[PDB]
Each structure stands twice: as C-alpha cells, then as structure tokens.
mmCIF file of C-alpha atoms in Angstrom:
data_model
loop_
_atom_site.group_PDB
_atom_site.id
_atom_site.type_symbol
_atom_site.label_atom_id
_atom_site.label_comp_id
_atom_site.label_asym_id
_atom_site.label_seq_id
_atom_site.Cartn_x
_atom_site.Cartn_y
_atom_site.Cartn_z
ATOM 1 C CA UNK A 1 -32.113 75.520 18.943
ATOM 2 C CA UNK A 2 -32.360 79.350 19.215
ATOM 3 C CA UNK A 3 -33.695 80.459 22.609
ATOM 4 C CA UNK A 4 -35.035 83.891 23.504
ATOM 5 C CA UNK A 5 -34.533 84.620 27.228
ATOM 6 C CA UNK A 6 -35.656 88.277 27.098
ATOM 7 C CA UNK A 7 -36.447 91.240 24.873
ATOM 8 C CA UNK A 8 -35.956 94.952 25.627
ATOM 9 C CA UNK A 9 -39.189 96.004 23.810
ATOM 10 C CA UNK A 10 -42.712 94.563 24.168
ATOM 11 C CA UNK A 11 -44.631 97.051 21.961
ATOM 12 C CA UNK A 12 -44.457 99.941 19.540
ATOM 13 C CA UNK A 13 -46.614 102.035 17.268
ATOM 14 C CA UNK A 14 -47.953 100.357 14.061
ATOM 15 C CA UNK A 15 -45.253 101.872 11.834
ATOM 16 C CA UNK A 16 -42.561 99.805 13.455
ATOM 17 C CA UNK A 17 -39.141 100.989 12.406
ATOM 18 C CA UNK A 18 -37.464 100.832 15.831
ATOM 19 C CA UNK A 19 -34.759 98.521 17.240
ATOM 20 C CA UNK A 20 -35.489 95.607 19.531
ATOM 21 C CA UNK A 21 -32.717 93.748 21.341
ATOM 22 C CA UNK A 22 -33.221 90.036 22.003
ATOM 23 C CA UNK A 23 -31.046 88.257 24.549
ATOM 24 C CA UNK A 24 -30.660 84.518 24.521
ATOM 25 C CA UNK A 25 -28.694 81.547 23.259
ATOM 26 C CA UNK A 26 -27.647 79.842 20.018
ATOM 27 C CA UNK A 27 -28.082 82.753 17.639
ATOM 28 C CA UNK A 28 -25.797 82.736 14.611
ATOM 29 C CA UNK A 29 -24.907 84.919 11.646
ATOM 30 C CA UNK A 30 -27.707 83.158 9.785
ATOM 31 C CA UNK A 31 -30.441 83.693 12.427
ATOM 32 C CA UNK A 32 -33.642 85.200 11.103
ATOM 33 C CA UNK A 33 -36.445 86.980 13.019
ATOM 34 C CA UNK A 34 -39.947 86.510 11.697
ATOM 35 C CA UNK A 35 -43.138 88.179 12.903
ATOM 36 C CA UNK A 36 -46.398 86.311 12.563
ATOM 37 C CA UNK A 37 -50.038 86.552 13.618
ATOM 38 C CA UNK A 38 -52.732 83.891 13.828
ATOM 39 C CA UNK A 39 -56.466 83.815 14.421
ATOM 40 C CA UNK A 40 -57.817 81.938 17.472
ATOM 41 C CA UNK A 41 -58.453 78.950 15.222
ATOM 42 C CA UNK A 42 -54.785 78.884 14.183
ATOM 43 C CA UNK A 43 -54.939 80.316 10.667
ATOM 44 C CA UNK A 44 -51.864 82.413 9.941
ATOM 45 C CA UNK A 45 -52.976 85.829 8.723
ATOM 46 C CA UNK A 46 -49.626 87.646 8.760
ATOM 47 C CA UNK A 47 -45.897 86.959 8.272
ATOM 48 C CA UNK A 48 -43.069 89.449 7.933
ATOM 49 C CA UNK A 49 -39.344 88.824 8.223
ATOM 50 C CA UNK A 50 -37.635 91.503 10.294
ATOM 51 C CA UNK A 51 -34.290 93.045 9.324
ATOM 52 C CA UNK A 52 -31.429 91.950 11.606
ATOM 53 C CA UNK A 53 -28.222 93.938 11.958
ATOM 54 C CA UNK A 54 -25.858 91.062 11.386
ATOM 55 C CA UNK A 55 -22.789 93.145 12.302
ATOM 56 C CA UNK A 56 -23.972 94.003 15.836
ATOM 57 C CA UNK A 57 -25.537 90.601 16.531
ATOM 58 C CA UNK A 58 -23.794 87.742 18.345
ATOM 59 C CA UNK A 59 -24.652 84.303 19.764
ATOM 60 C CA UNK A 60 -26.489 85.810 22.727
ATOM 61 C CA UNK A 61 -27.848 89.083 21.223
ATOM 62 C CA UNK A 62 -29.816 89.956 18.116
ATOM 63 C CA UNK A 63 -30.456 93.511 17.010
ATOM 64 C CA UNK A 64 -33.795 93.605 15.186
ATOM 65 C CA UNK A 65 -35.776 96.233 13.326
ATOM 66 C CA UNK A 66 -39.456 95.847 14.276
ATOM 67 C CA UNK A 67 -41.519 95.565 11.058
ATOM 68 C CA UNK A 68 -44.388 97.780 10.027
ATOM 69 C CA UNK A 69 -47.596 96.046 11.132
ATOM 70 C CA UNK A 70 -49.875 94.490 8.476
ATOM 71 C CA UNK A 71 -52.601 97.170 8.879
ATOM 72 C CA UNK A 72 -51.489 100.623 9.797
ATOM 73 C CA UNK A 73 -55.157 101.710 10.412
ATOM 74 C CA UNK A 74 -55.973 99.506 13.386
ATOM 75 C CA UNK A 75 -58.029 101.174 16.087
ATOM 76 C CA UNK A 76 -57.084 99.006 19.095
ATOM 77 C CA UNK A 77 -53.840 97.276 19.930
ATOM 78 C CA UNK A 78 -53.020 94.020 18.181
ATOM 79 C CA UNK A 79 -51.110 91.087 19.710
ATOM 80 C CA UNK A 80 -48.624 89.325 17.402
ATOM 81 C CA UNK A 81 -45.768 86.837 17.709
ATOM 82 C CA UNK A 82 -42.193 86.595 16.595
ATOM 83 C CA UNK A 83 -39.741 83.730 16.259
ATOM 84 C CA UNK A 84 -35.966 83.410 15.899
ATOM 85 C CA UNK A 85 -35.167 80.786 13.223
ATOM 86 C CA UNK A 86 -31.706 79.407 12.544
ATOM 87 C CA UNK A 87 -36.953 75.933 10.137
ATOM 88 C CA UNK A 88 -34.959 75.224 13.254
ATOM 89 C CA UNK A 89 -37.329 77.688 15.312
ATOM 90 C CA UNK A 90 -37.492 79.265 18.847
ATOM 91 C CA UNK A 91 -40.596 79.319 21.027
ATOM 92 C CA UNK A 92 -42.970 82.103 19.949
ATOM 93 C CA UNK A 93 -42.482 85.467 21.603
ATOM 94 C CA UNK A 94 -45.162 88.115 22.232
ATOM 95 C CA UNK A 95 -45.316 91.683 20.911
ATOM 96 C CA UNK A 96 -48.088 94.311 20.647
ATOM 97 C CA UNK A 97 -48.595 97.003 18.022
ATOM 98 C CA UNK A 98 -50.531 100.114 19.004
ATOM 99 C CA UNK A 99 -52.569 102.464 16.841
ATOM 100 C CA UNK A 100 -51.304 105.853 15.710
ATOM 101 C CA UNK B 1 -43.533 64.854 19.217
ATOM 102 C CA UNK B 2 -39.991 66.153 19.137
ATOM 103 C CA UNK B 3 -40.583 69.903 18.899
ATOM 104 C CA UNK B 4 -41.721 71.579 22.158
ATOM 105 C CA UNK B 5 -45.300 72.684 22.663
ATOM 106 C CA UNK B 6 -45.738 76.346 21.803
ATOM 107 C CA UNK B 7 -48.354 78.904 22.869
ATOM 108 C CA UNK B 8 -48.984 81.678 20.327
ATOM 109 C CA UNK B 9 -52.161 83.129 21.805
ATOM 110 C CA UNK B 10 -54.653 82.841 24.593
ATOM 111 C CA UNK B 11 -58.211 84.217 24.396
ATOM 112 C CA UNK B 12 -58.247 85.094 28.090
ATOM 113 C CA UNK B 13 -55.646 87.091 30.091
ATOM 114 C CA UNK B 14 -57.460 87.287 33.394
ATOM 115 C CA UNK B 15 -60.457 86.196 35.414
ATOM 116 C CA UNK B 16 -61.934 86.230 38.874
ATOM 117 C CA UNK B 17 -60.485 83.914 41.553
ATOM 118 C CA UNK B 18 -63.456 81.595 41.132
ATOM 119 C CA UNK B 19 -61.911 80.097 37.920
ATOM 120 C CA UNK B 20 -64.076 77.746 35.857
ATOM 121 C CA UNK B 21 -64.265 79.715 32.619
ATOM 122 C CA UNK B 22 -62.881 78.278 29.396
ATOM 123 C CA UNK B 23 -59.595 79.553 28.009
ATOM 124 C CA UNK B 24 -58.601 78.718 24.382
ATOM 125 C CA UNK B 25 -54.898 78.391 23.627
ATOM 126 C CA UNK B 26 -53.685 78.633 20.067
ATOM 127 C CA UNK B 27 -50.353 77.185 19.250
ATOM 128 C CA UNK B 28 -48.273 74.344 17.979
ATOM 129 C CA UNK B 29 -47.408 70.703 18.787
ATOM 130 C CA UNK B 30 -50.288 69.913 21.087
ATOM 131 C CA UNK B 31 -51.358 66.319 21.366
ATOM 132 C CA UNK B 32 -54.140 64.327 22.990
ATOM 133 C CA UNK B 33 -51.992 64.028 26.129
ATOM 134 C CA UNK B 34 -50.916 67.695 26.357
ATOM 135 C CA UNK B 35 -51.332 69.027 29.906
ATOM 136 C CA UNK B 36 -51.733 72.609 31.036
ATOM 137 C CA UNK B 37 -50.300 73.608 34.384
ATOM 138 C CA UNK B 38 -50.888 76.887 36.272
ATOM 139 C CA UNK B 39 -48.171 78.089 38.592
ATOM 140 C CA UNK B 40 -47.301 80.950 40.942
ATOM 141 C CA UNK B 41 -43.804 82.097 41.873
ATOM 142 C CA UNK B 42 -42.190 84.318 44.475
ATOM 143 C CA UNK B 43 -40.436 87.549 43.477
ATOM 144 C CA UNK B 44 -37.126 85.603 43.372
ATOM 145 C CA UNK B 45 -38.714 83.120 40.975
ATOM 146 C CA UNK B 46 -39.383 80.052 43.070
ATOM 147 C CA UNK B 47 -42.605 78.104 42.468
ATOM 148 C CA UNK B 48 -45.083 78.125 45.363
ATOM 149 C CA UNK B 49 -48.224 76.871 43.639
ATOM 150 C CA UNK B 50 -48.979 74.350 40.895
ATOM 151 C CA UNK B 51 -52.376 73.283 39.621
ATOM 152 C CA UNK B 52 -53.142 71.249 36.511
ATOM 153 C CA UNK B 53 -56.005 72.624 34.488
ATOM 154 C CA UNK B 54 -58.561 70.336 32.903
ATOM 155 C CA UNK B 55 -58.242 70.128 29.145
ATOM 156 C CA UNK B 56 -61.412 69.390 27.199
ATOM 157 C CA UNK B 57 -59.942 66.479 25.174
ATOM 158 C CA UNK B 58 -63.117 66.313 23.006
ATOM 159 C CA UNK B 59 -62.292 69.713 21.546
ATOM 160 C CA UNK B 60 -58.468 69.401 21.259
ATOM 161 C CA UNK B 61 -56.583 70.023 17.996
ATOM 162 C CA UNK B 62 -52.828 70.043 17.236
ATOM 163 C CA UNK B 63 -53.026 73.830 17.380
ATOM 164 C CA UNK B 64 -55.851 74.504 19.889
ATOM 165 C CA UNK B 65 -56.374 73.552 23.473
ATOM 166 C CA UNK B 66 -59.631 74.248 25.357
ATOM 167 C CA UNK B 67 -58.756 74.660 29.057
ATOM 168 C CA UNK B 68 -60.785 75.043 32.221
ATOM 169 C CA UNK B 69 -59.161 77.877 34.192
ATOM 170 C CA UNK B 70 -58.460 76.584 37.758
ATOM 171 C CA UNK B 71 -59.863 78.325 40.796
ATOM 172 C CA UNK B 72 -57.117 80.389 42.414
ATOM 173 C CA UNK B 73 -55.566 78.994 45.612
ATOM 174 C CA UNK B 74 -57.009 81.706 47.861
ATOM 175 C CA UNK B 75 -60.331 83.298 46.992
ATOM 176 C CA UNK B 76 -59.976 85.925 49.751
ATOM 177 C CA UNK B 77 -57.265 88.021 48.044
ATOM 178 C CA UNK B 78 -57.878 91.743 47.864
ATOM 179 C CA UNK B 79 -55.488 92.667 45.064
ATOM 180 C CA UNK B 80 -54.814 90.947 41.730
ATOM 181 C CA UNK B 81 -52.253 88.121 41.610
ATOM 182 C CA UNK B 82 -50.028 87.479 38.608
ATOM 183 C CA UNK B 83 -49.499 83.767 37.788
ATOM 184 C CA UNK B 84 -48.116 81.704 34.918
ATOM 185 C CA UNK B 85 -49.163 78.645 32.953
ATOM 186 C CA UNK B 86 -47.482 76.292 30.560
ATOM 187 C CA UNK B 87 -48.256 73.412 28.191
ATOM 188 C CA UNK B 88 -46.281 70.217 28.756
ATOM 189 C CA UNK B 89 -46.003 67.049 26.592
ATOM 190 C CA UNK B 90 -44.676 64.061 28.476
ATOM 191 C CA UNK B 91 -42.305 64.545 31.345
ATOM 192 C CA UNK B 92 -40.138 67.450 30.233
ATOM 193 C CA UNK B 93 -41.051 69.183 26.950
ATOM 194 C CA UNK B 94 -42.787 72.355 28.017
ATOM 195 C CA UNK B 95 -43.725 75.676 26.540
ATOM 196 C CA UNK B 96 -42.245 78.820 27.936
ATOM 197 C CA UNK B 97 -44.334 80.372 30.753
ATOM 198 C CA UNK B 98 -47.404 82.343 29.691
ATOM 199 C CA UNK B 99 -48.913 85.104 31.862
ATOM 200 C CA UNK B 100 -52.325 85.218 33.547
ATOM 201 C CA UNK B 101 -53.877 87.360 36.312
ATOM 202 C CA UNK B 102 -56.484 86.416 38.901
ATOM 203 C CA UNK B 103 -58.728 89.248 40.151
ATOM 204 C CA UNK B 104 -60.352 89.501 43.609
ATOM 205 C CA UNK B 105 -64.030 89.137 44.429
#
C-alpha cells in the first residue's frame, strides 16, 4: 500500500503550480496523486489529479505539482486532502490553500 | 473492514483543557466499534498520555464520528499543549495521527 511519511509543503496560494515532495514507501512508476475535498457530512465537492514527475520519482519519493484550487476567489484558507494511489490508496494527507 | 480507518477532516482543532465539547470527524471506514484515542508524546516521540474519547454511537456513520473531546490530563497548564488523536478499528488498524491543541484556562 502506498504510505506517505512526510511532505515538504503544507500550503500554498490558490493558484497552485509549485512542487511538493512526498517521502514514504511503496510508490511506483504508476503512482498517482489526487487532491480531494469533502464537506463535514462527507460529500466530496472537489477532486483533481496532480501531475507527477515520473522521471524524478522513486519508490520513496514523489515529485508532485500542486493543483490549482477549485475556487481561486476564496477569501479565507481552505483545508483539503490528497492521496497517493497505486484504488489501492494511502491514508489522506492534509494541505491548505490560501487566498491571493 | 480491511482498509484502515481514515480521517479527512475534523471540525475542531483546539479547545480549552476542560474538554467535553463535541468534535466531528469526517472520513472513511468507520464502524460501530471504531474507537478514538487521544495521545501526547515527548519531543523524541514517545507516548506519555493516552485517553479514549467517548464516541456517540447513536450518531455514527461510516464516514462520520461524533466524539466527546477528553479533558486534558492537567488543567493547570499555562501554555498550549499539542496532542494527537487517532481512530482505531479492532486491535491494530489505526488512522495516522491527527493534530489537536489544548489551551489553558
């Protein structure tokens, strides 16, 4: 199962478009990174696959481009999740987008 | 079930040392026997406190847990204390640690 032990970035501005490095175990050439957001009641209101640099990435490191957030006009920071998926998925990780 | 419990959000990140307020966890693979455990660790990562939190089983869903935040171990602190909590199904399938802060009174 993919495992995320740490991440070098916890937040960024809403545009995204910066690199995040994930350190962990059992990543492969086919690993995907997917960002999601739910409401408190569990309804999924966002999903966006993130671009992975498959040439730099290795079984214990993924090099990920943080996606543009769903709404670039937020006024307060928004908490989201991401997963590594080999549906074989990791625990959810935490990330925050901040307004411009 | 087979897949580990997962915590995607929490509606509360901190509270006073008194505890007692409800926290709602949103996630995956919760069951009627899911437990929530609050913990505290030293700087080198060893656990020095553990306290199970009461789950309101009459509100539980596979993707929501309704949790009574425990009182903190020492209500006489003068600075905030960072703690963790996790969801556990059975004896060993646990979520990764979540973060929580208790504030002094």
